[PDB]
RNA sequence: AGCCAGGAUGUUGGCUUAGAAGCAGCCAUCAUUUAAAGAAAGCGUAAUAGCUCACUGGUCGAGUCGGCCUGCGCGGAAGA
């Protein structure tokens, strides 16, 4: 397949504790490990890793196909890192960090203010820029979306939260 | 010459000085003080007697730069000048009126010669007896 | 500017790019919009304090304070260079290095009001009563008088163009105009008219010598925008109501005869949208 | 999302995934054009 | 199937020209170069600038694609 005509090649900063069914990755700034599903043969073959689908299992093509995608990011993701900024197009609404908390000007009578867990250096250039850093990739998407869940771009203005490479569809009121 | 980022020939009769903002999106690409190609091509224009669409190109650069290339005015609209009309399309193969020989062809081809590289003498011949048939024209010799 | 997204320098920097004319602020900002307190008057240097109940209290000036010491430092710099470009005078002794005190500085910039080509900004708030007791004394100081302005300026009632400046006190004919006409159903018709100078008594053949009419100058009553206070001596400058007007149009004249004349219709609009009441 | 028997491809740029086992069609700026029965 | 990637360029494609300027719609429906391009599919839109389909022109470097027939499966399926 085309996923079984990629290997991932693994480089030197990256340590992998092989298990069997049980990968813990010591990287560079984090330990990003997944205990995958019994679909998988894993081999840290020399250097490049190659994995297999398990027999009974036959759709472990995809179980695996899963594997192949994901430790390729995990590699890289402990070592160089996802940049994920937001953008706050908000009337009066601001972003400030401070240790691991977010601030959230978001139009209330009330502030709010969440803590946010670890694999994360979050940062604000400015009221309406914010960085967020980490190492997986499912953590660096699953507290951004929770933001931008809390305010959805808004399409008769453009209001809302959202993403930097994020292109919203703003409507015209066309009646009054 | 130059790619994706912009090349498009729009240019219509220039005795007007505006625009023409059916045009003037094409003026309307990359930044353009609008007075400045209105200054350009004057020079030249009054080397004319003008009535018939003039095309020109356009063709960008990356800071505030822009450049642009002058040819003759097509033979398209050079059928219809002499023709009277400027629109005769109503029926292709159901209207016989009007001829042109091919000794008028070539006249306005050697200005096409004189101009450009493509659109050449003996195979647009049979694509200005194409805009011909199309318009509903006859063409003998 | 007691509001989320209220910046003062933005506003007054933004008429640099879309008004496009030169605005020099003067009284800057001190907080962060909900705990704000300060004001920064930047020719005195001194910060006011504004009430915290007893909704009109206190106007305690301070100094400039420790948070916005930098700030009151690059503004300053900017306030002081607004005269020597105001005055040609100014210009040796901000290179110098004159002191440009409170003062000094006004002299040359009231005198750049009279051209307009700066405006002066104050932020603040109305309602939270910050900022309005400190609003009055650039009145007296940026905002033209009656009698520094050029005055009433009677040209002829016909022939050549003689554009003639009278005199801003009481020691001229007698000058007002017609606007504001409202109407009451006590008297009729009513005025909220202001003259310029000069002084009238009560009871007067005051015409409306643009369009040929007599008319008798009948009681002048004043009002706090709402209430009727009866104004007998009209002195120059009240604002009042030109009672009694026969018939009265749009900015003519309220003059006694053999005196100077206006007859000026400037910009006269276009009601345009037209809706037909039936009863 | 709107709720109909048919589910029938619609939009230029409609992707068709079994989320759950009821089938729920997928445009990209047209929130019109999804479907979820069938 | 994606990243580079030109969207080779005669033309204004008429009519009726107010814009119906490939992108409203009826008749033509040729092509100057054909290793890549149609007098044309939508969005941008009064018109177009922006973004593509067109051939993938150069890289990956193996399989892949749209329908016909049947074995069964899911949705359709809400009641006291």
Same mark, same amino acid.
């Given at each position: 397949?085309?996923?079984?005509?990629?290997?991932?090649?693994?480089?030197?900063?990256?340590?992998?504790? *092989?298990?069997?069914?049980? *990968?813990?990755?010591?990287?560079?700034?984090?330990?990003?490990?997944?205990?995958?599903? &019994?679909?998988?043969?894993?081999?840290?073959?020399?250097?490049?890793?190659?994995?297999?689908?398990? &027999?009974?299992?036959?759709?472990?093509?995809?179980?695996? %196909?899963?594997?192949?995608?994901?430790?390729?990011?995990?590699?890289?993701?402990?070592?160089? %890192?996802?940049?994920?900024?937001?953008?706050?197009? %908000?009337?009066?609404?601001?972003?400030?960090?401070?240790?691991?908390? *977010?601030?959230?000007?978001?139009?209330?009578?009330?502030?709010?203010?969440?803590?946010?867990?670890?694999?994360?250096?979050?940062?604000?250039?400015?009221?309406?820029?914010?960085?967020?850093?980490?190492?997986?990739?499912?953590?660096?998407?699953?507290?951004?979306?929770?933001?931008?869940?809390?305010?959805?771009?808004?399409?008769?203005?453009?209001?809302?939260?959202?993403?930097? &490479?994020?292109?919203?569809?703003?409507?015209?009121?066309?009646?009054? | 010459?130059?790619?994706?980022?912009?090349?498009?020939?729009?240019?219509?009769?220039?005795?007007?000085?505006?625009?023409?903002?059916?045009?003037?999106?094409?003026?309307?690409?990359?930044?353009?003080?609008?007075?400045?190609?209105?200054?350009?091509?004057?020079?030249?224009?009054?080397?004319?007697?003008?009535?018939?669409?003039?095309?020109?190109?356009?063709?960008?650069?990356?800071?505030?730069?822009?450049?642009?290339?002058?040819?003759?005015?097509?033979?398209?609209?050079?059928?219809?000048?002499?023709?009277?009309?400027?629109?005769?399309?109503?029926?292709?193969?159901?209207?016989?009126?009007?001829? $042109?020989?091919?000794?008028?062809?070539?006249? $306005?081809?050697?200005?096409?010669?004189?101009?450009?590289?493509?659109?050449? $003498?003996?195979?647009?011949?049979?694509?200005?007896?194409?805009?011909?048939?199309?318009?509903?024209?006859?063409?003998?010799? | 500017?007691?509001?989320?997204?209220?910046?003062?320098?933005?506003?007054?920097?933004?008429?640099?790019?879309?008004?496009?004319?030169?605005?020099?602020?003067?009284?800057?900002?001190?907080?962060?919009?909900?705990?704000?307190?300060?004001?920064?008057?930047?020719?005195?240097?001194?910060?006011?304090?504004?009430? =915290? @109940? =007893?909704?009109?209290?206190?106007?305690?000036?301070?100094?400039?304070? @420790?948070?916005?010491?930098?700030?009151?430092?690059?503004?300053?710099?900017?306030?002081?260079?607004?005269?020597?470009?105001?005055?040609?005078?100014?210009?040796?002794?901000?290179?110098?290095?004159?002191?440009?005190?409170?003062?000094?500085?006004?002299?040359?910039?009231?005198?750049?009001?009279?051209?307009?080509?700066?405006?002066?900004?104050?932020?603040?708030?109305?309602?939270?009563?910050?900022?309005?007791?400190?609003?009055?004394?650039?009145?007296?100081?940026?905002?033209?008088?009656?009698?520094?302005?050029?005055?009433?300026?009677?040209?002829?009632?016909?022939?050549?163009?003689?554009?003639?400046?009278?005199?801003?006190?009481?020691?001229?004919?007698?000058?007002?105009?017609?606007?504001?006409?409202?109407?009451?159903?006590?008297?009729?018709?009513?005025?909220?008219?202001?003259?310029?100078?000069?002084?009238?008594?009560?009871?007067?053949?005051?015409?409306?010598?643009?369009?040929?009419?007599?008319?008798?100058?009948?009681?002048?009553?004043?009002?706090?925008?709402?209430?009727?206070?009866?104004?007998?001596?009209?002195?120059?400058?009240?604002?009042?109501?030109?009672?009694?007007?026969?018939?009265?149009?749009?900015? =003519?004249?309220?003059?006694?005869?053999?005196?100077?004349?206006?007859?000026?219709?400037?910009?006269?609009?276009?009601?345009?949208?037209?809706?037909?009441?039936?009863? | 999302?709107? #709720?109909?028997?048919? #589910?029938?491809?619609?939009? +230029?740029?409609?992707?068709? #995934?079994?989320?759950?086992? #009821?089938? +729920?069609?997928?445009?990209?700026?047209?929130?019109?054009?999804?479907?979820?029965?069938?």
């Amino acid at each position: 397949s085309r996923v079984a005509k990629a290997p991932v090649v693994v480089p030197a900063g990256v340590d992998v504790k *092989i298990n069997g069914q049980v *990968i813990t990755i010591k990287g560079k700034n984090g330990e990003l490990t997944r205990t995958l599903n &019994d679909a998988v043969e894993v081999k840290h073959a020399d250097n490049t890793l190659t994995f297999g689908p398990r &027999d009974g299992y036959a759709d472990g093509w995809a179980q695996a %196909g899963t594997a192949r995608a994901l430790l390729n990011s995990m590699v890289i993701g402990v070592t160089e %890192g996802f940049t994920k900024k937001l953008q706050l197009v %908000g009337v009066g609404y601001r972003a400030a960090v401070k240790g691991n908390v *977010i601030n959230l000007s978001l139009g209330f009578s009330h502030p709010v203010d969440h803590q946010l867990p670890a694999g994360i250096t979050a940062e604000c250039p400015t009221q309406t820029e914010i960085v967020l850093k980490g190492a997986d990739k499912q953590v660096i998407g699953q507290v951004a979306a929770d933001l931008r869940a809390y305010r959805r771009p808004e399409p008769y203005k453009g209001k809302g939260v959202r993403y930097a &490479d994020e292109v919203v569809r703003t409507k015209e009121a066309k009646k009054k | 010459a130059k790619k994706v980022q912009a090349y498009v020939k729009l240019q219509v009769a220039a005795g007007m000085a505006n625009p023409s903002p059916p045009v003037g999106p094409a003026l309307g690409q990359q930044g353009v003080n609008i007075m400045e190609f209105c200054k350009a091509f004057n020079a030249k224009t009054d080397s004319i007697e003008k009535g018939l669409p003039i095309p020109v190109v356009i063709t960008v650069y990356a800071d505030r730069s822009f450049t642009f290339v002058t040819k003759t005015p097509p033979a398209a609209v050079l059928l219809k000048k002499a023709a009277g009309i400027k629109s005769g399309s109503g029926k292709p193969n159901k209207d016989k009126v009007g001829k $042109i020989s091919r000794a008028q062809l070539q006249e $306005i081809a050697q200005t096409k010669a004189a101009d450009m590289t493509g659109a050449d $003498i003996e195979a647009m011949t049979r694509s200005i007896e194409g805009t011909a048939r199309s318009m509903g024209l006859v063409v003998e010799d | 500017m007691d509001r989320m997204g209220a910046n003062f320098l933005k506003v007054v920097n933004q008429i640099k790019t879309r008004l496009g004319a030169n605005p020099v602020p003067l009284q800057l900002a001190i907080g962060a919009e909900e705990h704000f307190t300060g004001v920064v008057d930047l020719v005195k240097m001194k910060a006011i304090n504004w009430n =915290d @109940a =007893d909704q009109g209290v206190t106007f305690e000036y301070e100094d400039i304070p @420790a948070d916005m010491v930098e700030l009151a430092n690059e503004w300053h710099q900017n306030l002081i260079e607004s005269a020597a470009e105001a005055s040609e005078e100014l210009m040796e002794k901000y290179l110098g290095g004159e002191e440009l005190t409170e003062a000094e500085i006004k002299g040359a910039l009231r005198q750049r009001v009279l051209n307009n080509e700066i405006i002066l900004v104050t932020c603040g708030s109305a309602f939270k009563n910050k900022g309005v007791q400190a609003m009055l004394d650039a009145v007296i100081d940026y905002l033209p008088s009656p009698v520094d302005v050029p005055a009433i300026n009677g040209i002829l009632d016909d022939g050549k163009d003689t554009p003639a400046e009278r005199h801003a006190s009481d020691d001229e004919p007698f000058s007002a105009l017609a606007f504001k006409i409202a109407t009451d159903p006590f008297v009729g018709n009513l005025t909220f008219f202001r003259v310029y100078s000069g002084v009238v008594n009560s009871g007067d053949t005051v015409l409306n010598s643009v369009k040929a009419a007599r008319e008798r100058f009948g009681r002048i009553v004043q009002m706090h925008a709402n209430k009727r206070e009866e104004i007998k001596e009209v002195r120059a400058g009240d604002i009042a109501a030109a009672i009694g007007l026969k018939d009265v149009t749009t900015g =003519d004249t309220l003059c006694d005869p053999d005196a100077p004349i206006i007859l000026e219709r400037m910009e006269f609009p276009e009601p345009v949208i037209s809706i037909a009441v039936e009863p | 999302m709107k #709720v109909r028997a048919s #589910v029938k491809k619609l939009c +230029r740029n409609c992707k068709i #995934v079994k989320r759950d086992g #009821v089938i +729920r069609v997928i445009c990209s700026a047209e929130p019109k054009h999804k479907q979820r029965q069938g």
